[PDB]
RNA sequence: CGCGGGGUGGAGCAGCCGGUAGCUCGUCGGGCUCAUAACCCGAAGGUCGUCGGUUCAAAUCCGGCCCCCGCAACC
RNA sequence: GAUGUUAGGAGGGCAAAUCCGCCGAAUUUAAGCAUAUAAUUAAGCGGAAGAAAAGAAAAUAACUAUGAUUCCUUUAGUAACG
RNA sequence: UCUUAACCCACUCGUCUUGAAACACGGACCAAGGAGUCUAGCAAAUGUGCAAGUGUAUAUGAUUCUUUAAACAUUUUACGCAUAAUUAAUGUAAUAUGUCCAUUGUAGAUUUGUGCCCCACUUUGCAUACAAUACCGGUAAGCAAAUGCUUUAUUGAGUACGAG
RNA sequence: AUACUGACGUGCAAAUCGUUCAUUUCAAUCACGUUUAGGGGCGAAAGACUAAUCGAAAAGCCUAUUAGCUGGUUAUUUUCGAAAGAUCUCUCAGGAUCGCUGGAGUUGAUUAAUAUAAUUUUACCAGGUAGAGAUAAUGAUUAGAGGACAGGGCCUUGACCUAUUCUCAAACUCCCAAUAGGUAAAAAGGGCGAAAUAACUCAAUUUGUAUUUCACUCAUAUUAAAUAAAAUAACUCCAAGUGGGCCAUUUUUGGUAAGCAGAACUGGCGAUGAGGGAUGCUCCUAACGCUUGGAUAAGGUGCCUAAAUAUUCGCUCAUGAGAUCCCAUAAAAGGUGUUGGUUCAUAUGAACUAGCCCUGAAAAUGGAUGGCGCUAAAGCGGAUUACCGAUACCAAGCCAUAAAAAGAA
RNA sequence: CAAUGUGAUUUCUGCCCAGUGCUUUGAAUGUCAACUUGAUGAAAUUCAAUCAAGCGCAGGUAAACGGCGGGAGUAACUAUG
RNA sequence: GGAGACAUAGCCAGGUGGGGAGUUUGACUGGGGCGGUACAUCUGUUAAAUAUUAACGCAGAUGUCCAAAGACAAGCUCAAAGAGAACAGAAAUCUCUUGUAGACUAAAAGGGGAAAAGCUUGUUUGAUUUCUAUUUUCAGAACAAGUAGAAAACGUGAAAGCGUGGCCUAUCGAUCCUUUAUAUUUGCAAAAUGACGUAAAUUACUUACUACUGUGCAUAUAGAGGUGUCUGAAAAGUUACCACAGGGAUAACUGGCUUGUGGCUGCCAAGCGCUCCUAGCGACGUAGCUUUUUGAUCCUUCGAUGUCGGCUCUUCCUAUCAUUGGGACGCAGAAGUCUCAAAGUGUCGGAUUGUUCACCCGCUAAUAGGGAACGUGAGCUGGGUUUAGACCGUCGUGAGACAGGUUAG
RNA sequence: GACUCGUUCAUACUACAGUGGAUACACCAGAUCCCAUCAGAACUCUGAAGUUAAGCACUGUAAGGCUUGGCUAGUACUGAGGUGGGAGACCGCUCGGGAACACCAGGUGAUGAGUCAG
């Protein structure tokens, strides 16, 4: 309690090492808008549309964009319930999220696998691997490549 | 805190354009004897008994918000403008 | 003597007792907070689409019915 | 909140009565007596609290504040 | 205006549920309390009747108006007061 | 069934209390009496009757006059609440055909069909949810010779073929 | 009515009795008659007295005054079953509103799946605590060395530079975890296309946008990573109780410390017990309809007291031995008591080391490994088996509840 | 007569009127109400004005309530002052 | 006779007025009061690497200030160091060179900030009107503080752009009430108040047509005047004369935990002890024991466990004061000291005190230290602390207060 | 060969040296006009005389820094478990996860779009 806005300055709001005034051209230009997921990250430079403490490093969907503002739907736990909150943030604060990129790459790769299978009229599964239990194997070992271990005396 | 005595600004009445306004300090009217609440206060007070109507004997604040009365010089109509609580106010002084 | 100060005890367990609820409004985010001008342009488009649709629907129903 | 009054050398206080601001005290020096001293002089010294104006001349009168302490209503 | 054991008469007092007059509080309520509330009530002193009181317009309306009183149903927990 | 035995277990009940066998409190014993009710006004629930109405109020009527202090009837077109709302308030108060018709979506109960039954396609699309537009009262803004208007804003216990 | 604080103190008595003492011709004592009445009287004053009644009498009424406070609050079976957090409060013995609870309804569930999940997977993130650092910065902070201005008397002492150097902080941060936490995993959607709609956009009413209509088509016989008595889920309503908490491990702040004050995460207790811990609210095992049988858990197996005077290898003698988590003391320091080691020296001399055992080791009714006892242990450290051992667990019966089947000669 | 205080004799009863009281003077006096009077306005109203006590100013009062500090400088030693 | 339209009396009105009346006299609080404010807030830390989080935790800060220290543009680079210039070496200077921020950014601490958010300058007033979606605190209400926009009108650069106050985290207030802004919007309840306005008509009680109409009051909307016990009572003392409702949710008493403090025992070895570390000692350190002191404490008891001391009377301990047996000695003898087994036995008469304690005198064998509900009030006593009467002092306007003294209970 | 716009924002930095200047960059030349300052220093404008001396390009140096990797180290540290050990402080063990500094070795950039001259 006794809780003003930016409390925990030395914690979260502390800048990344040697990162001052970073404002280069590529930062702005991403454009996926109303469907997109987006991370909310603090910028050392920009104080103007800085979020509240809780929203740091969190991710949520963009629901509205303006000139250099972004509305973001973020989940917050409020005691007994997780609820969706309309977080207004700025363009400098929003970072494009990468979860979508994992889904998309998998969709593209699977689609290529599906397309290949379809051309052959094959019956095969495009589902992800489980990283299952290792099968049987073989190695040939000369006396030179095998080392005898034992515990160590104090030294 | 110091304001000049004129301001060219938006009038919210008739003239849409930015135009000159005179700036002065409001300081609260003297109370009427004809106000309905004052009549009620008089009625309640009259005859035997005490009173409740506005009094406070333990005051906290030494300060007042200043509200400026702005008079449009074009259309002859007035507007209020409110600004920060001050101990110290100055009019027209400059530096 | 003193009354209690911090304690947050049992509250997490109570939350998990009735389960930690999550929203379920889902589709079609709505009304006033929608983008000025652009959504009015969409309303005009929708009204246009609706007029073309209504013209098709009225003609098609009327010709068959009678 | 609306009425009355006081701010003047380091201290006490006259001038507020528009023709030009002083007088005590304490200080600082000097006469006077064969004495000490008391007494009597000469010095220093102040944005007349801050600000706007009336003419021949304004600390003083008109205009309005600030700091002080008296009356009050409110109750 | 007196005076009269003048002649003929009356009033007084008791009882009180309902009725009428004065006079007239506090507990209480507001989680306190001083205004408001309790309450024009309780107590107090008076007067009546089988019922009394009210009653024949110095009334209400603003209608195509109604037309002594009482009472019920109502307006109405409303206008309104605080 | 009652009765001792013997083995094993068994600390005063009620109580407020974090914690009572307590060096916490009430209880000598027994009997009888002895404590969430009734009225008012409000609410949801469910039953029940009727429905855009509903409730016969006060009251009148009778071959009603042991019961009958209720039961029965309503003249050989009052009032409550609901039938559109809004609002300081004068006030104002259409989703419109210019086949009784004609609000838009997406899910969604139910129905049609196909290829002696589940089906997989289609088909129709209630309720409800999630929206969407209108339009009505307030309030803006813009205009303004008023059946005051207006693209556009907002706001209401609003409305979109009555539910009480 | 002074004292014996005498007797009495369930009396002879709601102030008595005994003894002592003060008062006695006056501001004397006593009667009778009389006066003043309750916020009133009367008071040589003590808040005295006013009919056993007085810092506001007695009587009756308003009155069944009021009370966040105390006590009490009545038949049975069965079912679900809590809170002692929070927020606002002239608020800390309360209230309100959230939470957590029950009922009632609706929704959709029955298709071994989708919604869904105190979980992991693979992607994807967020961190500056544990840690670590001083030669990275900050605050510290101990030393010398190598150098070109200062203090003292060409020397010495310094400061100052440079390479170094010692110790540091959880209120410092170059770097930096684990744990815990967030987003992600396709059919009401997504692909790639065409056509439509606009008052947005852009020279560009198909430039983009968004929307829409048509298409063509994405795994899914089971699957778009696992796993799931995943619908016992949702959702709406109405109402209850509760708002003092307390205990344990780990992390932890204050305080010398505390069975002290205050937390964090989780689990308990409370409201809940059976078996063990001699004993015991919280430790361990384990949560309970009624019964029979089984096999075990924690825990034990000399006797009390149910199972082994079991087996097997050690260690241990104590003129206060020692005996099992929570658990109810014992340290620094010693020991030519015994037992293992290890480093050294020349089957002998040193030095260490840690096991046991001992000294160090004092206290209030008599006294406590729970008691007796126990030393070829029944002690302490292992290991090997057997046996006993809960209402839990398995099998069976029976009871009720829940759900599912299933039915209108 | 009423209201008080101190409490035989003997003996003395200092100082102080700022503060709080009580009390006295006022052709100088600051403030201070109802009414009344006048002004203003079409009226309602709104304003002025006046010779109340009172308080204030100015005195008197301690056998009224009451109260009774701090420094410096200073005596042929130290010391005290 | 006397006084006399003045008195007086009545009714208004101001004053005086604890004589009398009615009432108020917070909360947090390691009891309460005093004290503080942890009561509205903001920063860092405590905080246990998302978020949450407290204590009379720690380090603090708040009730402002700012026509610029607000706004935009443009230009510039600071603290410091060295080397130069008669003045700043050494009271706020001048130049060049080196200079990653070591400056500066009103305050308050932390964040952020170098072709700038610093500094300089120019031009300025958006410190604007209207409206949302929202975020912080949060019930996901308010207010307050924010964020992203939008409808206007502008400002600045004019070039993109940026501007809805202050670089960010801190700088503040409901309803009723008061007050002033605003309107082609309203009301004051059977009617009217600009105005016979504008037309016509006139044998008149004429007929049309007009968007903007008396004082006063009431609204509606918008600010502001205030609530710091900061979701907002018009509020002082005192009771040892007291009453009542409750309280071991809370003091004073034992007990209990703890044992800081008190008390007692250690280990060490620098010194002291003629010489000599240890006969006797023992600093500077470091380890325990006890509850014989006082705390810390608030678990127990508040529908009563009788609150000191003395007396009497008994029992238990040992940490032994003397007595017995001894060991050591710096023990010549005589003394005497340290000490071990030892609780078998003893441990007094008085003076002064309310007194534990204390302090003397005398004897003595020594006049040891302690436990038993601080041994012992249905054993006593009642002197003290501690009911009501009274007294003096201080303090308090007062009532009264006084772990101040005193007398009586 | 060079430049312009860039991108990543030190492999891109810094220091001391050396090598290179067709076209290009820059240093350089001047102040009437546009402009700007006390000051043509800078800034603006107009030139094009000289020059690699610097900037600029490139390399070098028991360079410093930065930067990857090893190694520090399965150490330090750490979740859950334990009627495990330890008188206490604490320390093992089961199932798991797991650093940092120092030190050593390597490295000192890559690249989109456009242009101009060879």
From Swiss-Prot, chain B:
InterPro entries reported for this sequence: Ribosomal_eL44, Ribosomal_LSU_eL42, Ribosomal_zn-bd
Sorted UniProt keywords: Cytoplasm, Ribonucleoprotein, Ribosomal protein
Protein role: Component of the ribosome, a large ribonucleoprotein complex responsible for the synthesis of proteins in the cell. The small ribosomal subunit (SSU) binds messenger RNAs (mRNAs) and translates the encoded message by selecting cognate aminoacyl-transfer RNA (tRNA) molecules. The large subunit (LSU) contains the ribosomal catalytic site termed the peptidyl transferase center (PTC), which catalyzes the formation of peptide bonds, thereby polymerizing the amino acids delivered by tRNAs into a polypeptide chain.
Source organism (scientific name): Plasmodium falciparum (isolate 3D7)
Protein name in UniProt: Large ribosomal subunit protein eL42
Signal peptide residues on this chain, from the entry's feature table: none
Source species, domain of life: Eukaryota
Record bears the keyword Transferase: no
């Amino acid at each position: 309690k006794s809780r003003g806005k930016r409390s925990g300055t030395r914690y979260k709001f502390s800048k990344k090492f040697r990162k001052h005034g970073e404002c280069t051209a590529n930062k702005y230009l991403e454009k996926l808008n109303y469907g997109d997921y987006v991370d909310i990250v603090c910028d050392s430079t920009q104080q103007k549309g800085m979020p509240f403490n809780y929203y740091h490093g969190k991710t949520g969907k963009i629901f509205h964009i303006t000139k250099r503002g972004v509305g973001v739907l973020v989940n917050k736990r409020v005691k007994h319930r997780i609820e969706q909150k309309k977080v207004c943030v700025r363009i400098e604060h929003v970072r494009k999220s990468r979860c979508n990129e994992d889904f998309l790459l998998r969709k593209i790769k699977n689609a290529e696998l599906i397309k290949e299978a379809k051309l052959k009229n094959e019956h095969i599964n495009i589902k992800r691997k489980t990283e299952g239990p290792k099968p049987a194997a073989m190695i040939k070992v000369p006396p030179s490549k095998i080392i005898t271990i034992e515990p160590l005396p104090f030294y | 805190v110091n304001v000049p005595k004129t301001r060219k600004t938006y009038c919210s009445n008739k003239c849409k354009k930015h135009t000159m306004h005179k700036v002065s300090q409001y300081k609260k009217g003297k109370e009427r004897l004809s106000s309905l609440g004052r009549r009620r206060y008089d009625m309640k007070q009259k005859g035997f008994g005490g009173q409740t109507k506005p009094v406070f004997k333990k005051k906290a604040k030494t300060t007042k918000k200043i509200v400026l009365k702005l008079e449009c010089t074009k259309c002859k109509k007035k507007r209020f403008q409110t600004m920060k609580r001050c101990k110290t106010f100055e009019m027209g002084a400059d530096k | 003597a003193k009354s209690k100060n911090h304690t947050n005890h049992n509250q997490n367990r109570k939350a998990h007792k009735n389960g930690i609820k999550k929203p379920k409004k889902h589709k079609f985010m709505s009304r006033k907070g929608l983008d000025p001008n652009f959504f009015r342009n969409q309303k005009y488009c929708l009204k246009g689409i609706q007029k073309k649709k209504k013209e098709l629907k009225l003609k098609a129903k009327q010709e068959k019915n009678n």
